[PDB]
Amino acid sequence: MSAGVITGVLLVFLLLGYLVYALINAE
Amino acid sequence: MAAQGFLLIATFLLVLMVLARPLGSGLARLINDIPLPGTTGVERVLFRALGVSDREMNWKQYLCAILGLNMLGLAVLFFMLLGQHYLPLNPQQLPGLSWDLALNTAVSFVTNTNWQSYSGETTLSYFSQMAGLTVQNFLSAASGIAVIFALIRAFTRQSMSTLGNAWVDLLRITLWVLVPVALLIALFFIQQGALQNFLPYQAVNTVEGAQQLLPMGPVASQEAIKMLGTNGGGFFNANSSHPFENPTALTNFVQMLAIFLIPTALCFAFGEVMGDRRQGRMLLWAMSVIFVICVGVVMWAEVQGNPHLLALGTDSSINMEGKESRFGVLVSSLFAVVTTAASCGAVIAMHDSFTALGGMVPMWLMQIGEVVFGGVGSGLYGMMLFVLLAVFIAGLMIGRTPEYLGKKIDVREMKLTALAILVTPTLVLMGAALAMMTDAGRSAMLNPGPHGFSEVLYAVSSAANNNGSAFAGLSANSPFWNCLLAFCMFVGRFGVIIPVMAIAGSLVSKKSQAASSGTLPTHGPLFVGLLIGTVLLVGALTFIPALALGPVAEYLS
Amino acid sequence: MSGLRPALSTFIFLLLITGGVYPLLTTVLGQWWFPWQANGSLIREGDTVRGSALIGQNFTGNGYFHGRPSATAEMPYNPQASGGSNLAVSNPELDKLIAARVAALRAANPDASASVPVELVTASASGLDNNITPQAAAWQIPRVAKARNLSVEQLTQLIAKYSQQPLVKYIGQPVVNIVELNLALDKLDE
Amino acid sequence: EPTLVVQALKEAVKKLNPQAQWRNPVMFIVWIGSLLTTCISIAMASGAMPGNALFSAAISGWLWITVLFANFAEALAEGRSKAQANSLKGVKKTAFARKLREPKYGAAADKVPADQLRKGDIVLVEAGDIIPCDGEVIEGGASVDESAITGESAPVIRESGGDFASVTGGTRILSDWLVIECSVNPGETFLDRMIAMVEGAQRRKTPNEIALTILLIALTIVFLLATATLWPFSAWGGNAVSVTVLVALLVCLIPTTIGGLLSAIGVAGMSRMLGANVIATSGRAVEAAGDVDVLLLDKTGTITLGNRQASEFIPAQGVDEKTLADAAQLASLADETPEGRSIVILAKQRFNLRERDVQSLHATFVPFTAQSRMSGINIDNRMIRKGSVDAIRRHVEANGGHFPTDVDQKVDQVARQGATPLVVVEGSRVLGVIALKDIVKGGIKERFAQLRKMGIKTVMITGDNRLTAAAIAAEAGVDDFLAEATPEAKLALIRQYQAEGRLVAMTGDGTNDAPALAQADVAVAMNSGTQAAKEAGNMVDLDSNPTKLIEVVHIGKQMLMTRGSLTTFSIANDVAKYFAIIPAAFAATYPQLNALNIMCLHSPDSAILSAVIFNALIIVFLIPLALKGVSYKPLTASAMLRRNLWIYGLGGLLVPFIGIKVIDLLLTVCGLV
Ligand SMILES: CCCCCCCCCCCCCCCCCC(=O)OC[C@H](COP(=O)([O-])OCC(O)COP(=O)([O-])OC[C@@H](COC(=O)CCCCCCCCCCCCCCCCC)OC(=O)CCCCCCCCCCCCCCCCC)OC(=O)CCCCCCCCCCCCCCCCC
Ligand SMILES: CCCCCCCCCCCCCCCCCC(=O)OC[C@H](COP(=O)([O-])OCC(O)COP(=O)([O-])OC[C@@H](COC(=O)CCCCCCCCCCCCCCCCC)OC(=O)CCCCCCCCCCCCCCCCC)OC(=O)CCCCCCCCCCCCCCCCC
Ligand SMILES: [K+]
Ligand SMILES: [K+]
Ligand SMILES: [K+]
Ligand SMILES: [K+]
Ligand SMILES: [K+]
Ligand SMILES: [K+]
Ligand SMILES: [K+]
Ligand SMILES: [K+]
Ligand SMILES: [K+]
């Protein structure tokens, strides 16, 4: 797609990965 | 009208509980590893011949067993669908399916979703219908009942490191709960008008001189296992609207009873095996309250149909479009709520032709996790995850460590419950997003406006929540749609099964305490309302923006 | 190794038992107890079939009873494509189709009431709908009587003969089998 | 909220480092969205993207204010803990020590600061100087003002007797020289351990907070998925929803109240625990003390548990009130019992009794004994023993003195009042009676009945005979009582109470009941030197009150239910957040969705600002509840669930509507939007 759309989708994916990692961890 | 609908709801509910309590006792006997009467003596010989010594296995081995049998089913069905023309029972000599449709159908029928992106009578042969669909409708249902059997066993057993036997569980479920009851239901279907033949497609000389090619086949047995196992994979294009499939209102009533039979009997079995029936009655009360409210809302929405019919000169404004005539609009609405609450792809009525408000409540009620009388066992451990959230919140309120029926809930259980509750909404949301950012997903469209996004969201919810009920206007035969829905079905079922299995394996290692006065009871109207509030509030917080962009915008339009 | 034996054994046993025995036993029990119900309920009149008693047929004739709209692929009443009209409530295409059907039925039935029944203008879930309400049949009586040179009382008696009320009033609706009613109408007239 | 603390804590807040933010995932997500909205606002102001370029700036600023408010919550809790930390440590930062080479006073006093001196030394302290060392005493004697531990300022005798020769902390001496050999090094000093505790906040999260963060992270994930998927969904129908509106809805939907107030709740609850004279190393033990089902209260050295305390002084015929208070203060000076502490505190509150010059008296002091139930001194040749009325009657009848007069109707009057009569004697003549009244305003019987209504069981263990134990049990209102206690018997009692799947919390002596304290799930140790106690675990009670385990149950259930109530409140606000933002967010994509705006708001950007402003300000408005906990009513579990629902779930379903409405009304009157 476009640059803004793809950077929004990738930022959402990194935020989701960070939140899943935080849920897996206990700190 | 309102009195007729209330009478229908009350009659269906009371007949369901009456017919499902003895099946609850039977499933309780299967849970407690006690053989059914008239089964031992040959059950031991069968296990000796099959090489199963009834050796107890833990959660890792049990989950690996169920998953391996599910991969075996997926592979066998995929090869059978690719090579169906080499196999016998080809009245029309139908060619083999394409790779995308074959993979989607295989994943759909192994994941107990039974989504259909095709017309059955012009796609699949008699051998495919007889083996690859009926066997999977038995096996996926048996796998779900086995998972909930092991979860109930985990809630019972004190400080043991094992759960049960997967092969004994699946064999007992399939041979005693599934085959005889579906045999009785299929015999009633042949008592009514339904096909159980193998004749070729009989050409018909129409009275006015047209040509009709009637699709004969082995329909009644697939109907019976479809209705009993909460499957929803129809023989024809219409999953239950076909008169060779649902000829009478008595057949429709038996269909709804068979849909709700095993979730109700599983709740009764849970209540009996725990020792305290109040927990099973708590679950039944919560699901029944949500179900009654949903049926009332959908019945009112379908009775107060479109004003366009009244404007263009019809005697009534009842939305009869996309609904069969042998069943009423109230019966169609009740079946829609039943089939979108219990993870069944069978439909009396076309759900596109439903009113926006009457199609919102099926959509939201299947988006909450398919937990209100859901699946076959699947909705019961969906209720288990939701009551784990409820007991965690309530334990926080009362200031004590959360404890459901004696066993405390800890960090590992909280993590796995959170992951299991995360798995299906994320699949719905990213699947609908990926369908809306691609022209391959936006090219299969039928209706314009917010109803089109409603169609896309309903299809992705059907894949991810193991329903298979479809807004049939969406053309899901595209390779992208088939792959996306198959991925959603696979990840949905198996990524809910795996963390709840880790929950069971965590729960077997714990010892239940003694019910003191300080412990919160898990029964009563307070906890029933708390669980209802938890389920509806989580479903709202997950899907109000999507329903606002879809069915709410359609209704206000 | 250790898991490949019971998995394969259970899978082959359950596959054979279910897929072979259950449809075979169901089929032999069906063809032994309910023939002409497991075989399609085909109306047979002299070594030929004129349709099932359940499927329903396209009736565009003036002297016949017109059923519900079907909207199936490649043909109105096509059992090979037993789908349905999945047009939305807010669909202008459905609005114009309903308006066209209302105009056509008003042109075809002038002596009846101005407000057409909902069943005759709204398509069914499966296009193979053999059933209409007795009120729709009573709406259709005058045109059939004028076409066949019959009486309203005789048409009402025939419709009530072929009206099939359910066992319980509130689990369904009373319906009229259009194909059997038209076949009996033709047999009585000729 | 005093200004001199709040301003410094805001100065600590102003460091909004991302390293300090990513430990809390909810407000790290809020911080990332705030930075995203700020960058969008700067790009729109420069000219990269069109639009308002001021609505986005206001949204970004208020999201930054939300982050600053959560940091204000956390740092306000840390500063409230550090105020009580510096109320004890801050004297010892700038002080001095008087060293010595031999235990004899007749030596040259070396001047070493000794702020880093190792153990096994010899120091000196005299004439109001602050004691800089924590060890034992081989000779000397002085009155010690234990303000830094007790918080009530009461003198104690610190002399080499065997049990009264243990100094603790930077504690003020009051009489004369007292040689001290410090047996610890810095780091294991009491003030250093309190420093490590107040800097040890949220180093290790409790399991309850961990599971709550897991649920909050799951809610954050589903809200993030819905917000992120709104752009593809709304981009098909009309124009797409603006990114700043999506980030505002994301932050305003994510539970940020409890997400920003969780660490504040934990630190404020542990500060409340420290203010209850309880040294708790970890909060997991506090949560377990909130989680137990039975309570064991070891009464072996104290009298009538610890609720009864001194209320007023009743004189005699031949004595004066001042002389009676002087005798009582001198008798109970050498008593670490809560009864003797209450006697000293009451005497101080009445007549400002102070330093007594113990070395000039040249009197050997005998402490309290469990078997004798007696405590007295040896001034000149007379005994100033005091205790229970039966024991002191036996003591005065053991000699040739005549029996006292009118004391029978005096103790009858105080028994009709409902108090335990404490009697002092000069050796032959009874100097008066003291009424020990319960310090609980609602009554210890009502408190124990409320504990019974909570479902948690109360059991007390008495070292006396069956009659005294039954009398004290009937006076208090406990469920079970034990007599002739041995450590084997109490360990067996703990085992047979744990045999039915129940959690046992037991308080007692850390030096005499250590294996049974380790056997119990929660151990509120008392009457110890506290060094090995804090080393092993064994939650240290400062004033040695046996009834403070009830206070831990209070502060150790209140934190958990405050967490749950605020979690439910933050979850329930989001219905009104939908009803405020969804018509505002979809005003141009679907203009038909304005019917969902049930509250008559002016404009969509005004609605978004109102919702974001309320989401920011709710943390500030719930600061007092998070700091003070919840004023909860002890009832059954179902009744507590019903009350907590009716208060906090209905608050979350009602007050965001009112708050968003009044904030939008203020915005429309003031004309910003
Ligand atoms: C609009 C009406 C709303 C209410 C509908 C009725 C709901 C039940 C009524 C309960 C109230 C009266 C009972 C007094 C005690 C109350 C406390 C209690 O816990 O009751 C449990 C009550 C009995 O438990 P229990 O007496 O405490 O236990 C005694 C035994 O030791 C435990 O073992 P046991 O109970 O299995 O053994 C006894 C049983 C032996 O078991 C059997 O062999 C078969 C019987 C089991 C099924 C019974 C039929 C259940 C049908 C439920 C749905 C009815 C239609 C509702 C449709 C609503 C549509 C708006 O035989 C019985 O005696 C049955 C109890 C008789 C009471 C019900 C009378 C039957 C008439 C049908 C209902 C008509 C209305 C009732 C009056 C309500 C006021 C208007 O539950 C039952 O009645 C049967 C248990 C299994 C079903 C529970 C699931 C309930 C589903 C709710 C559906 C309703 C819709 C939701 C409302 C939506 C609103 C928005
Ligand atoms: C916003 C929060 C609001 C909180 C509401 C709290 C209401 C408290 C009212 C104050 C008055 C109570 C004082 C007397 C107490 C003792 C009376 C008694 O026997 O038990 C009554 C009960 C005491 O609790 P319990 O310990 O379980 O009862 C012990 C019994 O032995 C065990 O019960 P039993 O079965 O043995 O009782 C036998 C008999 C005894 O009858 C009596 O004597 C009752 C005496 C009180 C009369 C009031 C009627 C209470 C029961 C009707 C509840 C339905 C209407 C709900 C109205 C709510 C407002 C009151 O009852 C019956 O005839 C049939 C009972 C069969 C059980 C199935 C109940 C039907 C399902 C309805 C579920 C709730 C409605 C759906 C809500 C959906 C909202 C999303 O107190 C209640 O009133 C319960 C109503 C609670 C409504 C749920 C609120 C839902 C709000 C949204 C959910 C929030 C979730 C947020 C989560 C956020 C994070 C995820
Ligand atoms: K399904
Ligand atoms: K289907
Ligand atoms: K879910
Ligand atoms: K689920
Ligand atoms: K399911
Ligand atoms: K599922
Ligand atoms: K959800
Ligand atoms: K969650
Ligand atoms: K919030």
Numbering used by the authors:
A (entry chain D): 1 to 27
B (entry chain A): 1 to 557
C (entry chain C): 1 to 190
D (entry chain B): 10 to 682
Quote from the publication.
KdpFABC is a high-affinity prokaryotic K+ uptake system that forms a functional chimera between a channel-like subunit (KdpA) and a P-type ATPase (KdpB). The heterotetrametric KdpFABC complex comprises four subunits, namely the channel-like KdpA, a member of the superfamily of K+ transporters (SKT), the P-type ATPase KdpB, the lipid-like stabilizer KdpF, and KdpC, whose function is still unknown. At high K+ levels, KdpFABC needs to be inhibited to prevent excessive K+ accumulation to the point of toxicity. This is achieved by a phosphorylation of the serine residue in the TGES162 motif in the A domain of the pump subunit KdpB (KdpBS162-P).
